[PDB]
Amino acid sequence: EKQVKVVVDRDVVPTSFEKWAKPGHFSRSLAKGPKTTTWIWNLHADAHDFDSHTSSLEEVSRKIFSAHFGQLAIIFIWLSGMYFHGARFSNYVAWLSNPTGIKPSAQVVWPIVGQQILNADVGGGMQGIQITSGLFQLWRASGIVNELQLYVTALGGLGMAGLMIFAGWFHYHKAAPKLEWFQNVESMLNHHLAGLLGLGSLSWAGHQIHVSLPINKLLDAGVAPSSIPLPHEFILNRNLMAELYPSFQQGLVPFFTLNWKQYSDILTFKGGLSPVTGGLWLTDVAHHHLAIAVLFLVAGHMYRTNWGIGHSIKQILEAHKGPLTGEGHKGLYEILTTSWHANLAINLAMLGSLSIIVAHHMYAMPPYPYLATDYPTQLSLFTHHMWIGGFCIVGAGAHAAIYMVRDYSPTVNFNNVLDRMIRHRDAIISHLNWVCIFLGMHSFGLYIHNDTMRALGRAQDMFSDTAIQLQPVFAQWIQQIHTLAPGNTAVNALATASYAFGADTVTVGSKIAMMPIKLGTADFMVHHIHAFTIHVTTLILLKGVLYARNSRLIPDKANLGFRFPCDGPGRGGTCQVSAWDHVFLGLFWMYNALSIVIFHFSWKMQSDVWGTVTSNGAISHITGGNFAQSAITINGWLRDFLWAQASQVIQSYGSSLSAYGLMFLGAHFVWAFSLMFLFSGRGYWQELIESIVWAHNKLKVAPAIAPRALSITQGRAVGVAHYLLGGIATTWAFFLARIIAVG
Amino acid sequence: MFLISWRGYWQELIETLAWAHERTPLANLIRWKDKPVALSIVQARLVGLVHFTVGYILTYAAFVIASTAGKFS
Amino acid sequence: DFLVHHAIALGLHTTTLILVKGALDARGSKLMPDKKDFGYSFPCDGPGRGGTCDISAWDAFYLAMFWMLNTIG
Amino acid sequence: ALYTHHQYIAGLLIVGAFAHGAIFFIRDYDPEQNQDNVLARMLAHKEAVISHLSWVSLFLGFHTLGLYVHNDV
Amino acid sequence: AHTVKIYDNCIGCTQCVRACPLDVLEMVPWDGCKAGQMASAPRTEDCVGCKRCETACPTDFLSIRVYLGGETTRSMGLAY
Amino acid sequence: LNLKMPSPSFLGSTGGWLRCAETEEKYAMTWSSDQQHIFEMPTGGAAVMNSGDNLLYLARKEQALALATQLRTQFKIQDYKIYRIFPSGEVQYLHPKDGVLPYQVNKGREQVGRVKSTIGKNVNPAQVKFTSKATYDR
Amino acid sequence: VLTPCQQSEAFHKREINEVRTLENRQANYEANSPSYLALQSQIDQVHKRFDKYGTLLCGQDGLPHLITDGDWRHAREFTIPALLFLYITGWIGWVGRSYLKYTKETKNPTEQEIILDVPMALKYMLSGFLWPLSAWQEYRSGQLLAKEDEITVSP
Amino acid sequence: IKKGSLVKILRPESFWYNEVGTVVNVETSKVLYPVLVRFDKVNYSGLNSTNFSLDELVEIK
């Protein structure tokens, strides 16, 4: 039994500006003076690498706890900024009065160089830039009706940021916990499961029951936002809550008497989207938060902490052992308690996967009101969370490789799952590479074959609905099962979880909110393309992590480090052999996969879901059924999607969307500038810099800091950074301009 | 492809493929006469430059011919 | 026409810069004084001395090929 | 088609001329027999030539792209 | 079949031998420096061209030069 | 030498020598230890070196030398010998080849691959054109 | 051919088009309310800008074309801004060169380059207001151009 | 050329060619390159000093 106690060191680090005037103080090599321009880049490259600074785990743990506080403060400042922008420079009240007619906007551009044109006529009196972040819908779902609440929330956010600033400084210069702290994974998990998530969802459920539910009910009943009672009135005067929800007449007595069924007025399970706003029923959302809170709270009492009751993660890990895995998960507990890189890899992979799942679930089941009708917001949110998820996944792979190169130990990883995997890494990577080849052929080859057939006039020999058909029978079957679930497998559910599986369509403000997303041959091919790209990117990352320590080409890659340029022009060439380079390649592949994924979502939504509905139910999509026969060929993807939909971003000049068009061009430049750093080497730039330095010497204007070219690894990093920035910015401007100009 | 990815990722990949080919039944009989190896550093630059050049020329050739044809035909 | 002719000038000058630099620095450079001893086309000199990727003159030609395609484009 | 044809071939031809000049410097040039020659002198002040070419290319790029983006904005 | 050549500017610091991963270099008695030792490459058949020695050389201009020539199984680092 | 020497306790792995090693060169490393240390095999994995004599086979000289480097660094083991075995069966002593580490100056070694003066005196490629001579050759 | 914009119908047509574009959006708003005043200021600025540009030369497209041939009549178009740019950038270059020359005289010039010495940096920035005159006398004294620099093999 | 004597380099392949450097020490064991020279500037390998011969250096003032 180990005491889960708190031990801290007081005044461990002094608070002074002495170290601010000595850049590179955290590194022994960087504290001796630059001597070259490469030191400037190395200073920032190794600034947040706390593991390279010192060899003590305690110091790294403290440098992480702090700086986590700093990032939390940065997030709180950003949130406060969003709330203040909504309260001061946004048409939030006007939007509340007419959510469908008024375009959300919370940014006002200053009139200086003709940029005042960017202030679009979003309505509501004010003119500004239309925001697609969903801030307006979220605030409405939270019960915000006046800008005073937005101002108070902004002030509270600023205060929380100040608190997260003080906490970060206090936990590094006034009270720094010892390594025994931070190694209590059982206590940290129990608290995060029952306090950070469990109690958090419980509190949010309470807020929704007492604020979101009544305010939104009155809003959806035709009551003006100014005439709705204040949130505190619903708590003080129980008569109002009783009138809006008779369940409140019984009070909390039913909860304590197990007569939970009496809460059918506030805790419903309707299942579908609200026909008035198009979003999920707030009652179902509150009931969902209550259930997730109770489930997380119960889950938070699993591990053992300072008491006999509970579980030991190490015991559970070591208990799992089988014939095909000699030692099972033995030694993994010590791995996740002595290396922050391993924990960061697992957490980054899970956080990225969670973000991707969030994107899918948010578009399919619009949670906020009027979110579905605001297609710009829907496109931006799905695409945004999809991108952040992919970036976090690539980062997860990078940190896994980092741990493998630096924190790995043969004694700890002996005959366990990790060691057993490293033993047969060749089978893993060759079989996975074979899967990638098969997927690419059977996914992209289908598209290429269709291009060849259509060009030859042999349309009868294509992979389409009319010609050879490839129907996702399994996915279509799951959709049908979901369509029939509300009556045979969900007895208490009154409607399908998502109308995208089937049921009927929902229209709000003469606009389609969510209708069944039928899958055909085009969806079959695109889904296989998605799987192919995911397989190749995971192959690149897994290869980099498995061979991070050694390989048949370089027997001691670990000694060379995780981030090294190459072993030289030997053994035929060992360029981009380090794991860091594998992450560098995985970034491009993740970008390609994610770009294709967002492209499919955008086109499919604009051709089969998003659109207008005329009286009597007639439906007219933005691109009427063109995805069925145009998404099956690369030519169609270039003509009906990249060319047809780009007209909005190229013709945006002279209007409020001109900025997007400008960003559309700028991004291209950046994407084309990255090529400079990707198809070139530092030897040539060093020679060019030598000639330029001679020119400077001829005028006695040479700098003391010897100018040097970017390192090989730094050059690769700059190239990938510019490539991703340009590509994501181009598709960002294209998506936003296309969705704002139409729909 | 060749202009971005350099030799070293492909060398290890080919080693993995070599292991797979010589460790699978019914296909061990077939043995490569020349040991598989990744494209050399300079060979990669030349192959990538040739691909880029072929694409640049063919893309603009198709564009110019098709545009001048459809526009005036 | 004035602006695009200036762009044409930019391209011609940058391509001749890369090519002239490749021809003049083909025998040696402060980074690799013995470049002439390694021939015209060689991969590199390893990551030593900060890095020597694309040090050979052949790479200067390969870097100038992209600029020629851009200028002529 | 013909204008683009000949211009692209011209670009390839001039780039090849410069590449062969570099090959000449590395393989068919002996400074011992070219002393104080115009060619040897070119190699003597190569740094000045490269620096001025770099300045011209930088000036043209900065100004031409600045004017194009200014008009665009 | 790469050719490794040691020049007279060698200071006998042994860093090239210590950084060579194929036992291609060694130290032999010499009288051109106070160290009384000079780098030698009597096993160049095992060299692969990684140039780790070139990177580990401290002289102004590398006293050890590795020229990539004939390619064999050893030089290509093929375990298959 | 001593092909019957005991081997470290390893559980296989898919990174060991392939068929090519059978029909071609196959390196071997034989070292002695006093404690059953756990070392990372150059092929990927973890093994326990038998207390006493340890003998293992590899497909590359660099792999054996890397293993020797880690045995000398992670552990104070300096009596590591690397041999080479050909398909015919004749063994060849490769490392250290003389009982002394390469970076340790030892008598009896003859300088190989020496060039007079610095590299700045190398002849131009034009002076040795159409001949079987190199610039580094004096 | 080029004609003054004040006498070109294209210029007036463009001015009217811009005014119409602004007025179309201005009509939606109310006289005294947020916005509508924002568009009136833009219209006034458009009128002033066109009246200012009327003196320039423009062709058929009506876009003001700038003559850079060096004609005195068009000095304000390119000559004056060209001279003012050269003065500003020569000032920047000369102050930077002097600061570098001073830093090279310190014990560790690298530290000065990283952590700029605001006192001396400002001392050289404030000065140099006569950089064209300072460029000379430095050249005449031989303190501007160097004699021997770093050169690789085959000079 | 002795202790701390400014000397200009003459080696063409040297990174500090045509540059001045200080003499840290001079060998007396009859070696090929007995003059150790240190420079304020660093080369591409991060090293500032190196050995040279008498014929490869010229004393300055």
Ligand code: CLA
């Ligand atoms: C962390 C989440 C959270 C938080 C902070 C709150 C916070 C609050 N809730 Mg609440 N609630 C939540 C979640 C949450 N809730 C959830 C998940 C549910 C289920 C969906 C409810 C359902 C609920 C109801 C129905 C009511 C509240 C009420 C309240 C407020 C007073 C509670 C109270 O003590 O009254 C105590 C009330 C009692 C009846 C005590 C029970 C035992 C008494 C002593 C019986 C003995 C007889 C006696 C004579 C009293 C007669 C009462 C009878 C006439 C009803 C309070 C601010 C009450 C309120 O103020 O309405 C605005 C209210 O009626 N909540």
Ligand code: CLA
């Ligand atoms: C004014 C109060 C104060 C003072 C005097 C110090 C002083 C010191 N701190 Mg400290 N610290 C503070 C507050 C303070 N800190 C707070 C509030 C936190 C919580 C975040 C921390 C957490 C912290 C950690 C974890 C560490 C230190 C360390 C140090 C020491 C060296 C590092 C350094 O200061 O370089 C100066 C560095 C900066 C000025 C960069 C900071 C950048 C800020 C935090 C965020 C930037 C956000 C964003 C990118 C801005 C937008 C820019 C652009 C993109 C638009 C030094 C004695 C380090 C040490 O080694 O101690 C010996 C150490 O590891 N501090």
Ligand code: CLA
């Ligand atoms: C129920 C108790 C509890 C709660 C609610 C939290 C909550 C949190 N912890 Mg934490 N932790 C706890 C107990 C708890 N912890 C214990 C007992 C240990 C030791 C075993 C740890 C050790 C620990 C570490 C090492 C780290 C965290 C981190 C975090 C933050 C994760 C980042 C995030 O998701 O943003 C969500 C943010 C919010 C929702 C804002 C809420 C913030 C308020 C102030 C609630 C937190 C209360 C705090 C735990 C205790 C107050 C102390 C009091 C003296 C003032 C989050 C705020 C990480 C972090 O970010 O560092 C700062 C991290 O590095 N925790």
Ligand code: CLA
């Ligand atoms: C919670 C997420 C998270 C965290 C905490 C870390 C933490 C860390 N990472 Mg990691 N990483 C992450 C996510 C994360 N990473 C993701 C998502 C990726 C994929 C992109 C990576 C890929 C990655 C690599 C490849 C490496 C690290 C490294 C590191 C370590 C050192 C970082 C450093 O000092 O560089 C300093 C940071 C900078 C100099 C900033 C670079 C700026 C880039 C280009 C982003 C620009 C964004 C911005 C929006 C651009 C537009 C604005 C512009 C116009 C100005 C450190 C412990 C390095 C390491 O382990 O050391 C060996 C390492 O090599 N990371």
Ligand code: CLA
């Ligand atoms: C995934 C999207 C995508 C991608 C990756 C590409 C990629 C490419 N396209 Mg393409 N294209 C796309 C979508 C895409 N296209 C779509 C949706 C359409 C409409 C159907 C087109 C229509 C199209 C045409 C008509 C052409 C291409 C061409 C090309 C190739 C140009 C070769 C090069 O290196 O650039 C070179 C880049 C440039 C020359 C600049 C391009 C445009 C700028 C604005 C011209 C400015 C000229 C100016 C005078 C230069 C000086 C300015 C400077 C001083 C500031 C390249 C392979 C061209 C080609 O055949 O290759 C030569 C070609 O003519 N594309």
Ligand code: CLA
């Ligand atoms: C969009 C693609 C692109 C662009 C813009 C450039 C641009 C340039 N290349 Mg180049 N190149 C490219 C692709 C590109 N290349 C590719 C694919 C290759 C094949 C590998 C090459 C290979 C190559 C070689 C071999 C050489 C160049 C050289 C040059 C420079 C020529 C001199 C000049 O015009 O300077 C003018 C500057 C510009 C045109 C850049 C615009 C100015 C910027 C935007 C201003 C500064 C940033 C600004 C403040 C905004 C950022 C703010 C910040 C907060 C984020 C120039 C900067 C030559 C050189 O070095 O010249 C001396 C050189 O020899 N390139």
Ligand code: CLA
């Ligand atoms: C003391 C500052 C300074 C001075 C006086 C010069 C002067 C010169 N440079 Mg240079 N340069 C500088 C900084 C400076 N440069 C910096 C910081 C860079 C890296 C971006 C370069 C990169 C550079 C290149 C690539 C080239 C020159 C070239 C030249 C020469 C021709 C003009 C030119 O093309 O400029 C070009 C100027 C730039 C590209 C950007 C200048 C950067 C800023 C805006 C100015 C410096 C501000 C400085 C920090 C001020 C210090 C003030 C002090 C009091 C604290 C000329 C003698 C050319 C040459 O080789 O000669 C023929 C050439 O090709 N420079």
Ligand SMILES: CCCCCCCCCCCCCCCC(=O)OC[C@H](COP(=O)(O)OC[C@@H](O)CO)OC(=O)CCCCCCCCCCCCCCC
């Ligand atoms: C065969 C029925 C399963 C349907 C296939 C999809 C299952 C999804 C789980 C993925 C792993 C595959 C299950 C066998 C794997 C499995 O569970 O085996 C059983 C075994 C686990 O049993 P142990 O006795 O080792 O249990 C002890 C430890 O697990 C302690 O928890 O796992 C292995 O040791 C081998 C691991 C992968 C072996 C290589 C297979 C790789 C192929 C991957 C592709 C799978 C098929 C793709 C879909 C067509």
Ligand SMILES: CC1=C(/C=C/C(C)=C/C=C/C(C)=C/C=C/C=C(C)/C=C/C=C(C)/C=C/C2=C(C)C[C@H](O)CC2(C)C)C(C)(C)C[C@H](O)C1
């Ligand atoms: C478990 C148990 C029970 C009761 C357990 C109880 C009472 C649990 C209570 C949980 C509560 C009250 C949790 C409260 C959570 C959070 C609150 C009240 C405030 C949160 C933060 C807000 C509202 C602000 C958020 C911002 C916004 C929205 C954006 C930021 O930019 C700025 C900023 C202002 C920070 C019963 C059954 C009664 C018996 C008892 O013996 C045991």
Ligand SMILES: CC1=C(/C=C/C(C)=C/C=CC(/C)=C/C=C/C=C(C)/C=C/C=C(C)/C=C/C2=C(C)CCCC2(C)C)C(C)(C)CCC1
């Ligand atoms: C009649 C007349 C005229 C005249 C003119 C003149 C007389 C001039 C010119 C001209 C010229 C004059 C031109 C040119 C061109 C050139 C070029 C295009 C070049 C080149 C080169 C290259 C490309 C390279 C080289 C090299 C190298 C690389 C290295 C080694 C050496 C050599 C040399 C081989 C005009 C039209 C005005 C007008 C009318 C009248």
Ligand SMILES: CC1=C(C/C=C(\C)CCC[C@H](C)CCC[C@H](C)CCCC(C)C)C(=O)c2ccccc2C1=O
């Ligand atoms: C262009 C390029 C270079 C040259 C790029 C350089 C030298 C970029 C660094 C230049 C910096 C950004 C300019 C100096 C900034 C100073 C701080 C000056 C600021 C002065 C005022 C503006 C404040 C490489 O070194 C390279 C290396 C390896 C692969 C590809 C490439 C590559 O593509």
Ligand code: SF4
């Ligand atoms: S210099 Fe570049 S191309 Fe050459 S081996 Fe090193 S990383 Fe590879």
Ligand code: SF4
């Ligand atoms: S190139 Fe590599 S293997 Fe060859 S001698 Fe040098 S360090 Fe040894």
